[PDB]
Each structure stands twice: as structure tokens, then as C-alpha cells.
Design a protein around this ligand. Structure first.
Ligand SMILES: [K+]
Ligand SMILES: [K+]
Ligand SMILES: [K+]
Ligand SMILES: [K+]
Ligand SMILES: [K+]
Ligand SMILES: [K+]
Ligand SMILES: [K+]
Ligand SMILES: [Mg+2]
Ligand SMILES: [Mg+2]
Ligand SMILES: [Mg+2]
Ligand SMILES: [Mg+2]
Ligand SMILES: [Mg+2]
Ligand SMILES: [Mg+2]
Ligand SMILES: [Mg+2]
Ligand SMILES: [Mg+2]
Ligand SMILES: [Mg+2]
Ligand SMILES: [Mg+2]
Ligand SMILES: [Mg+2]
Ligand SMILES: [Mg+2]
Ligand SMILES: [Mg+2]
Ligand SMILES: [Mg+2]
Ligand SMILES: [Mg+2]
Ligand SMILES: [Mg+2]
Ligand SMILES: [Mg+2]
Ligand SMILES: [Mg+2]
Ligand SMILES: [Mg+2]
Ligand SMILES: [Mg+2]
Ligand SMILES: [Mg+2]
Ligand SMILES: [Mg+2]
Ligand SMILES: [Mg+2]
Lengths: 239, 142, 62, 201, 127, 46
RNA sequence: GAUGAGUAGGAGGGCGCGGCGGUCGCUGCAAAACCUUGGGCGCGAGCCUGGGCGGAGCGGCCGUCGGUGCAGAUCUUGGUG
RNA sequence: AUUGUGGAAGGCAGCGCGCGCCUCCGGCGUGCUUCGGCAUCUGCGCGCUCCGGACGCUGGCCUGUGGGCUCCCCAUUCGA
RNA sequence: AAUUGUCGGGAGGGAAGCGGAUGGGGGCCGGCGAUGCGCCCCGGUCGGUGUGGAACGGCGAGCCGGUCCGCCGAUCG
């Protein structure tokens, strides 16, 4: 009754369901893992949000406390910098050209974060007229990572459309969501080097409203050098 | 075929009497194959009528809107005069469609060519109808 | 402009296929292209690469 | 069953109450008790041979999740509002807005007696809504719809009578406002030094 | 026959690339030649000069070589070669070769109607 | 011994598209609701 | 996923000319060449085609070969302003 | 204002209505709480949405003085 | 082909030609642009489960099939 199914077809069909069964189990296992992760990242994001507000109020309280006692409160030195290249790639002296490459600033208006230490600060001092930098606030870090954040996966530029991209590279370091990535950058945590290097250099646009004078230092009324908290004002117009 | 089909494809894929190439070897290049046992006349190992022991032939047969359904015999690869198992069909399209499905897919002869064979049968059958009566619609709508 | 070398492209050349027209060698290459891809075996990957190599890069063994 | 929505939306897509609050309001705690301390589990909701086989596999477009929404009505346009037509044969004429049809077009009347504009559909993008309002409470146009303006020349007498019935109830309201009859009988136009971006309507 | 192609054809450039100074000199033909001169302003790409063809002008691969009618051309020299397009009548259109006799064109045109194969020049030399 | 047989997502701005933001940061919904409710109380109080 | 300047220079993939070994064709119901404000294809070298002229040969494809591609040389011969 | 590239997936994410009652802009049970609240209970089924890249409707026109054009001549602004 | 006459179109305030963008006037193009499809009945035409023959096939002695002819039944396509 009916054409006899050849042995080859039966063998292939038998293995297909086994692969389908194993493949099907992944969705159930992955779905449960995903459900738990959503609660995890939700609580971490809630915890991070509380920490940011506490730090802001903690700084205000300390400054007021010093005022009441008649002394001074020296704010902690900035731990994080955001550096933007403001000059082109023409007529590059060899030393500046090398340093900008180490900072991953290969194109004008590209931007990157940089941890603050004597080694990095001295490097930055040697490319002062080619860059402008300062201290990014929480808002700036959020906008950059959320709007123009791309992850380097296997030396490829991948848009941070889902938290799976972040976990694929930084998962072993405990960073599983974009909020974890934001927290690591802002606080300069133990895994800042991996988290920051994971971020592709930000491809910012030409500033809305333009620049004053790229050839002069920000102190002289130009645009180059350290502008401290005023980098945030520039980040709004370039992001 | 008398040698493995994969070996034959390596030999005939570059040059054979049925290979039709036009417009050079640049982007404009167009390639077709015109062996009678190539359903889509495509120059590929899948549809090749030279590099496959099991091949399907569907073409008009003689007169009276008859359609020939011939399949190459697996044990007669060295006997050209008896390689084809011809079956002349002169019934409705639905009956012919079932016969093609039975001799191509149901017996696991060339299941990968079932879609091509039915389309080939559909094209051949339609042309026979037009020949008997003549063109009546331009088939340009949609 | 972008400060890269040759637009970030590789300037290295390696054999991605045999230079020979031997039909049997190409069949072996097809066989071991499949094995390397579907198994991830380091042995298969090494075998596939050595099938591309020129005569002097495949010296005889006594 | 529930008579009102449990979670009002502060903004589009965000509810007023959190998940913890909704659990109390949904009553899942009560449902759990009635089912032996467990939330009940349900079950998932449980041809002709072709006459021609195409040679090329057919391609079907991917699914698009966006669904069109009904055309919005400009805030300046309210029932009884006087509208100025900006295009077509009736360009410049002032008509009375009656209602918005299901297609999103506006149902307007001249009225036909005053300016010769009958019951007609006018696209919202080609009209300007003025600040003049004429009462249309006594006007009944429930019988009018999109199908009333659909093709299938002499105008049938049936539509002429329908125009008069709607027109008659509107003339009395118009006559109440002094100088409104003449206002609706004259077309709007731009004179020398008249700047549209400065005009108040 | 209904063409299978559905994407619109976008021509990056419709004008031809004329050889520099072919207007000035009769002996210099219009077929493109890359200028090799050291001072050539065309080679150096000064604005307001003749444009040179480069790969950037490449047409979309999905609409490349498609005629305005929506098909690709295949040149046919007899009835037998016309039958090769039976299964590609929604993609390829036939064009009878310029040197085919009027007597043999009638056979090709008649056969193409039966196979529903588009002929681009079916009215050629029949008057 | 063979292993089992095996397109780019259009990036959207989470700063504008709500659902995209919630996909990356589920807590963003709670922050949004609290800010809206907090503002409503202040407006009513004034 | 990234990326695109290029003289001298190098290399790759292609276009075109004339034979040879094969293969598939066209032609007195009109081949080659030539002409055209006909039409189309290719980034481009070029290719396909309508019409005309002409009146007897010609082309595609694979391989292989060469006295194989011109705007210049106070270039050669011929012709013409 | 510019733009719809893709044509295999109803996936991912966030919610709503049912599966328990009430006087229904809301109310009724544990845990935690800064007493405002809370991803603490928040599972299933069927649906919705800013959710793995545009869909829908209407008209005009279809041998016309129409439409299209890479072809020809010419004009004009910019370039040269 | 250079070059020349003629007829026709057009332009021209001390060069002309050329790149790019439109416009005017020409010339050219019906694969330049469709007219089908689905479901109904009127008629016409052409073929239809189970058993008999003819020439064969797929899988490997034996199972599993289609094509063509004829005969019944079935009475649709
Ligand atoms: K030959
Ligand atoms: K020509
Ligand atoms: K040759
Ligand atoms: K838009
Ligand atoms: K038309
Ligand atoms: K000009
Ligand atoms: K002349
Ligand atoms: Mg400089
Ligand atoms: Mg960049
Ligand atoms: Mg501006
Ligand atoms: Mg300036
Ligand atoms: Mg300087
Ligand atoms: Mg670039
Ligand atoms: Mg270079
Ligand atoms: Mg072109
Ligand atoms: Mg120079
Ligand atoms: Mg000719
Ligand atoms: Mg280059
Ligand atoms: Mg030749
Ligand atoms: Mg000429
Ligand atoms: Mg040739
Ligand atoms: Mg010679
Ligand atoms: Mg020579
Ligand atoms: Mg010369
Ligand atoms: Mg030279
Ligand atoms: Mg000379
Ligand atoms: Mg001389
Ligand atoms: Mg002289
Ligand atoms: Mg599309
Ligand atoms: Mg001449």
C-alpha cells in the first residue's frame, strides 16, 4: 500500500525532528532565561537611578556643610572625559597623528570616552589644538550610547538595537544591558577598559550652530582644549 | 553518464555543444542550456541534462496536443537508444499533472525538480492550446 | 577623510582556491569545503588550505 | 464584568498604575484562591488543484504591523463652522460645515439657495475654518453618507428635494444673524496689501 | 507576458561619456578614452570639464541590463533558439538577429506568439 | 559528525520611540510614569 | 561590517581585430562593408537592433595563435582646405 | 522638509480584556515601604501598540493638441 | 572622411566649441499603456471506479507505479 519510503529519506527525517526537538528546547530555555534577565536589568536600572540622585544630593550637602563651618570642600577630580576631534586629517605632524590613533579619533568630529590618569592626561596635552574635551554629565552619556552607540563585535560595528549585543561581548564582565554599560562608563568601574573599548568611536555630526574658532584655545575664545562641564553644551549640538 | 555526475559537471560546465552564451563574459553575460532533458534550460548542475543520471524531459509529442513525459533509466546509462522511458500523455491537464507528480516526486526520482516539471508541463500544455486555435489574449494585464 | 591605511583594507594575499584546473582536485576542494564548514574541525580546515597550495608548497615525502 | 478601564493612560502607551498595583486590581489574588492557590491554565485555540503552475516562485510581501488611523479633524472646524473653499470650481465661496464623513472628508452646504453650493464633500486640506458659527442643531443629515456621493447628465429630482429639506432648516438659523446671509453669498478674495499669514479667520 | 521585475529602474546617468576634445578634432572619435596627459585638466578633474566614467556610476544590480519594457534581451537566430526562452518568458524577451531573412522572421514571430515570448523587433522587414 | 544545519535591524532612536526604549531599558517606563504623576501633583497643588 | 585621491610604476578582471582546431548558426525571401535627427543596453572599452544602400558572403560560443587596437613622432603615402 | 531600501518571519518588547467579586474616573488579599509607593505575588488564553525598513484611498489619462525620451537645433543661469 | 554646392531649420554687439541644469521648437517611441480574472447556467465539444490486454518503469526473487487501448460500472469533470 503506497510507495515504500526509501531508507535515505527515513534517516534524514529522523534526524530532522531530533534537531527540531533540541532547537525547540532552546526557545523554552532561552525564554525563561530572558524573563529572569528582564527582572534583573529592571532592578539594576532602578538601583542605578537611585545612586545617581543620591550622589547629586550628596555633593550639594557636602558643599553646604563646608559653607556652614566656614571652610572649603574640594570636589573630587573628574574621572571621565569625553574627547572630540575638531581638526581634519590634513598636514598631520607624526606625533599628533600617532596619539589620535591611540585615542581612536581618526575622523573629525569623532568622539570617545577616556579615563582620567596621569598617563592619559599627558597624552591628551600633546594633541590639545586638535581636540576639545571635558566632563560629560549623565545626560550626555545616555544620549551618546542610546542614539549613536555601536558595539564592536568581532571587529565589526554593530548597532546597539538589543541588549543581546551588549551581552554577547561584555556578558562575562557582568554587563548585560545598555543601562549596565552606562553605569560602567559614568562611574569608571573596574571593567571600564573593556566596556569603553567595546564602544565604537562615536560618529558625531557637525555642530548645530557651528564653532567659534577651531584654531584658538577655548580659553582664548576658541574651541580647542579643555572646556570642563561646557563639553555637555557642545554634545547637545553635535549629537 | 557512466561516470559520476559530479565529475561530468566539472567537464561540461565550461564548454559543451548545448551551451548558449551571449553578450560576452562580463556583467551582460547570459547563459542558457538547450539539451532536451533540461526543464528550465538553465546551465546549472541542478538542471543539467548531461551531469545527472535521473533527468526529466517534458516536450510536445508529435500531434494532437500530446505531451511526452520521459525519464532517464538508471540502469541504461550506457545505452542511449534505450535510456529514455517515454510516456505519451493525451488527457486533461489535471490527469497529466498527477502523472508528472507521480513519476518525479512520489517515487523519489527527482523531488527537487517537481516544481520545474509542473511548470514545464504547464508551459508546454498552454503552447499546444494556442497552436491549435491561435493567440486570443495578450496576457499583459497585472 | 578617515585616517586609515589603504582605506582600512587588507594588503595581504592568500590562496582562496587551487590554481589548478584538475577536475579531481576541485571535487576534493568541494568535499573539504563542506567538511570544514559543517564540522568546525581544525584538521579539516588545515586540509582545505593545503589543497590550494602550489607544487613547491606540497613537497614530496619519502 | 468590569465597566471601566482599569489602567488609564497618562500618555499614549503608558498606564497610570504599575504592575504591582494592577495585580491587585486585576484580582489575580482572588482568582488564585478560587482555583486551589493556582492560576488556571488554558489551552491554545485549536485545495482545488491548480490549473497552471508558474515557472517563477511567487513572492509575498512581508507583514506590516502599521494600521491606518481615521483622518483627524482640525480643531478649528466644528459643526456649524463657516468654511472657505480654496480650490476647485467653488474656490472662494463660503459654505457651512455640517459633519465629517467616515472617509474623513467634510460634508458642507452652501446653502445652495444663498450661493449655489449643494451638499458636497470637500477635502479638509483645501478649506480654511473661520471663527463664524451658525447653529445647525435643527439640521438632520443622518441620511447622508459617503455612498450618497458615489457615481454609478441630469441631476435626479430626489437629490434636489433632499437639498431643500436640509437647506430649509438652515436658512432660519442664518437669517437670525444680521448680515450673515450676505456674508455667505459673497466669495472671499485677497485685495491689495492683504497678507494671508496675518489675516484672522 | 507580465514582466517579473518590480523595482523601478534608476539610471545614475543617462548622458554618454564623450571622449575629450572629440568635438574639436574630426579624427578624434567619441568612444571613451582615458586621458593620460600630464597636464590634462580632464584627468585632474577640474570643475567645468568633461567627466570621466568610474565605478560609482554602476547601476543597481537588480535592475541592470533591463530594457524599458521590463525584460532582458536575448538574441535569437532561428525558431529552435526561441524555444530556450519558454520557461523564462516573464524575465527574458527575444530579439531577432539583424541578418535573419524576412521569411524566417515570420516563423519566429509565429512561434513566439504560441510560447508567449516577447519580441522586441517583431515588425522588422515585413513590409 | 556534522553540526545541525543553520537581516540588519533598522536602528531606531530610543530617545523618541517609546517601545524601542522599553526594549533596552524596561525601567524607563517606571521613570516615565513617576515623572508624569509627580508633575501632575505639583500642577494641581499650585 | 568597514571603506573609496593618485603621476612614475605594478597587477587583476574585461572589450575589440585577424587566423587555426572544434562546435552552434545566418544568407539572393538579400551576407560583408558603408550611411542614418530611428531605438535600446553597459560605469566604460563596446554591444544589440530599426531603416537605407549594396549584391555574395558572414557570424556566435569553447580552446588556441598573432605582422592584433593611434591624435601627436618638423611621423610615412595619398587626398583636401 | 527629504525618504520606503527589504519581501522568509505576527518574532522581540510593553500592555489590554477574560480565567474571582464590588456601589465601577474607583474599591476588595499577602510581602516590602521613604507611607507617595513597589518587577512582592505579575501564570495561561485571546487581542492591542511609538513593537524584526509604507501602506491605504481618490482622481486624471490611456491613439489625443496625450505621455515619455538617453535623440536633434536653440535660448538662458552657473561652470569652463 | 577631409573638403564643396544647393535646398530646408536655426543662431550671431571684438572668437567658437565644451561640462552641468532646465526650458522652447523639432524628431522619434504603441512591449509608448491594460482590458483580464473569479464564480454562476444555456448550449456545444472532449475525457471519466472495478476488471482485461500492449509496451515499460522506480526500489532492489519480490514489492511499488505511471502511460496507451478495450470492456463494465459511475455518472462528474
Ligand atoms: K566558426
Ligand atoms: K544603427
Ligand atoms: K579567436
Ligand atoms: K514623512
Ligand atoms: K495615458
Ligand atoms: K549653457
Ligand atoms: K549640406
Ligand atoms: Mg592647514
Ligand atoms: Mg565616520
Ligand atoms: Mg540653521
Ligand atoms: Mg568660522
Ligand atoms: Mg595653522
Ligand atoms: Mg569616505
Ligand atoms: Mg591608496
Ligand atoms: Mg548609458
Ligand atoms: Mg603636473
Ligand atoms: Mg540592416
Ligand atoms: Mg583609487
Ligand atoms: Mg572576428
Ligand atoms: Mg550626422
Ligand atoms: Mg563579436
Ligand atoms: Mg598574419
Ligand atoms: Mg603593429
Ligand atoms: Mg591619424
Ligand atoms: Mg599619444
Ligand atoms: Mg605632419
Ligand atoms: Mg603630405
Ligand atoms: Mg592649397
Ligand atoms: Mg520596498
Ligand atoms: Mg562629407
Amino acid at each position: 500500500g503506497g510507495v515504500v519510503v526509501p531508507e535515505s529519506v527515513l534517516k534524514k527525517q529522523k534526524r530532522n525532528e531530533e534537531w527540531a526537538l533540541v532547537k525547540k528546547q532552546e526557545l523554552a530555555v532561552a525564554k525563561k532565561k530572558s524573563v529572569e534577565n528582564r527582572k534583573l536589568i529592571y532592578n539594576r536600572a532602578k538601583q542605578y537611578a537611585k545612586e545617581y540622585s543620591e550622589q547629586e544630593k550628596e555633593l550639594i550637602r557636602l558643599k553646604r556643610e563646608a559653607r556652614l563651618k566656614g571652610g572649603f570642600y574640594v570636589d573630587p577630580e573628574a574621572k571621565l572625559l569625553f574627547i572630540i576631534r575638531i581638526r581634519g586629517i590634513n598636514a598631520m605632524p607624526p606625533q599628533t597623528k600617532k596619539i589620535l590613533q591611540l585615542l581612536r579619533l581618526r575622523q573629525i568630529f569623532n568622539g570617545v570616552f577616556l579615563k582620567v590618569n596621569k598617563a592619559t592626561v599627558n597624552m591628551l596635552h600633546r594633541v590639545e589644538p586638535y581636540v576639545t574635551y571635558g566632563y560629560p554629565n549623565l545626560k550626555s552619556i545616555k544620549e551618546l550610547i542610546y542614539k549613536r552607540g555601536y558595539g564592536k563585535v568581532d571587529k565589526q560595528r554593530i548597532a546597539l538595537t538589543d541588549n543581546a549585543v551588549v551581552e554577547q561581548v561584555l556578558g562575562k564582565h557582568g554587563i548585560i544591558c545598555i543601562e549596565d554599560l552606562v553605569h560602567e562608563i559614568i562611574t569608571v568601574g573596574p571593567h571600564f577598559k573593556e566596556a569603553n573599548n567595546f564602544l565604537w568611536p562615536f560618529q558625531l555630526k557637525a555642530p548645530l550652530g557651528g564653532l567659534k574658532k577651531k584654531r584658538n584655545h577655548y580659553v582664548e575664545g576658541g574651541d580647542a582644549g579643555n572646556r570642563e562641564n561646557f563639553i555637555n553644551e557642545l554634545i547637545r549640538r553635535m549629537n | 553518464t557512466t561516470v559520476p555526475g559530479q565529475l561530468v559537471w566539472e567537464i561540461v560546465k565550461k564548454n559543451n555543444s548545448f551551451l548558449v552564451k551571449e553578450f560576452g563574459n562580463g556583467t551582460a553575460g547570459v547563459v542558457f542550456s538547450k539539451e532536451p532533458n533540461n526543464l528550465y534550460n538553465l546551465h546549472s548542475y541542478k538542471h543539467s541534462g548531461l551531469a545527472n543520471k535521473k533527468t526529466v524531459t517534458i516536450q510536445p509529442d508529435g500531434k494532437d496536443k500530446s505531451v511526452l513525459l520521459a525519464t532517464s533509466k538508471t540502469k541504461k546509462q550506457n545505452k542511449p537508444s534505450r535510456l529514455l522511458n517515454k510516456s505519451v500523455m493525451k488527457k486533461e491537464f489535471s490527469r497529466m499533472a498527477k502523472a508528472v507528480t507521480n513519476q518525479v516526486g512520489d517515487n523519489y526520482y527527482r523531488p527537487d525538480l517537481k516544481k520545474a516539471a509542473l511548470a514545464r508541463l504547464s508551459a508546454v500544455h498552454r503552447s499546444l492550446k494556442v497552436t491549435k486555435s491561435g493567440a486570443k489574449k495578450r496576457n499583459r494585464q497585472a | 577623510g578617515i585616517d586609515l591605511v589603504a582605506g582600512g583594507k587588507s594588503k595581504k594575499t592568500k590562496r582562496t582556491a587551487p590554481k589548478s584546473d584538475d577536475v579531481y582536485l576541485k571535487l576534493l576542494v568541494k568535499l573539504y569545503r563542506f567538511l570544514a564548514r559543517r564540522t568546525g574541525s581544525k584538521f579539516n580546515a588545515v586540509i582545505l588550505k593545503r589543497l590550494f597550495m602550489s607544487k613547491i608548497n606540497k613537497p614530496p615525502l619519502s | 464584568a468590569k465597566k471601566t478601564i482599569r489602567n488609564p493612560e497618562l500618555i499614549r502607551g503608558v498606564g497610570k498604575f504599575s504592575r504591582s498595583k494592577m495585580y491587585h486590581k486585576k484580582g489575580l489574588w482572588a482568582i488564585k484562591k478560587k482555583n486551589g492557590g493556582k492560576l488556571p491554565l488554558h489551552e491554545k485555540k485549536p485545495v482545488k488543484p491548480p490549473k497552471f503552475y508558474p515557472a517563477d516562485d511567487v513572492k509575498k510581501p512581508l507583514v506590516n504591523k502599521h494600521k491606518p488611523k481615521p483622518t483627524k479633524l482640525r480643531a478649528s472646524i466644528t459643526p456649524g463652522t463657516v468654511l472657505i473653499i480654496l480650490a476647485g470650481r467653488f474656490k472662494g465661496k463660503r459654505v457651512v460645515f455640517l459633519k465629517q464623513l467616515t472617509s474623513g472628508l467634510l460634508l458642507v452646504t452652501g446653502p445652495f439657495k444663498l450661493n449655489g453650493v449643494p451638499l458636497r464633500r470637500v477635502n479638509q486640506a483645501y478649506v480654511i475654518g473661520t471663527s463664524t458659527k451658525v447653529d445647525v442643531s435643527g439640521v438632520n443629515v443622518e441620511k447622508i453618507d459617503d455612498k450618497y456621493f458615489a457615481k454609478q447628465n441630469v441631476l435626479p429630482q430626489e437629490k434636489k428635494d433632499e437639498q431643500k429639506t436640509v437647506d430649509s432648516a438652515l436658512l432660519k438659523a442664518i437669517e437670525g444673524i444680521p448680515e450673515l446671509k450676505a456674508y455667505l453669498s459673497a466669495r472671499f478674495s485677497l485685495k491689495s496689501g492683504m497678507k494671508p499669514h496675518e489675516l484672522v479667520f | 507576458a507580465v514582466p517579473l521585475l518590480n523595482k523601478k529602474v534608476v539610471k545614475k546617468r543617462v548622458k554618454r561619456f564623450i571622449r575629450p576634445q572629440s568635438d574639436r578634432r574630426i579624427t578624434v572619435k567619441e568612444s571613451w578614452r582615458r586621458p593620460k596627459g600630464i597636464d590634462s585638466r580632464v584627468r585632474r578633474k577640474f570643475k567645468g570639464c568633461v567627466l570621466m566614467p568610474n565605478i560609482g556610476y554602476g547601476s543597481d544590480k537588480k535592475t541592470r541590463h533591463y530594457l524599458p519594457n521590463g525584460f532582458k534581451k536575448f538574441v535569437v537566430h532561428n525558431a529552435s533558439e526561441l524555444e530556450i526562452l519558454m520557461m523564462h518568458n516573464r524575465t527574458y524577451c527575444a530579439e531577432i538577429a539583424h541578418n535573419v531573412s524576412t521569411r524566417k522572421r515570420k516563423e519566429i514571430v509565429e512561434r513566439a506568439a504560441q510560447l508567449d515570448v516577447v519580441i522586441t523587433n517583431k515588425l522588422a522587414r515585413l513590409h | 559528525v556534522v553540526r545541525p544545519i543553520k537581516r540588519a535591524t533598522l536602528k531606531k532612536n530610543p530617545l523618541k520611540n517609546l517601545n524601542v526604549l522599553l526594549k533596552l531599558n524596561p525601567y524607563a517606563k517606571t521613570a516615565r510614569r513617576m515623572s508624569l504623576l509627580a508633575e501632575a501633583q505639583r500642577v494641581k497643588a499650585k
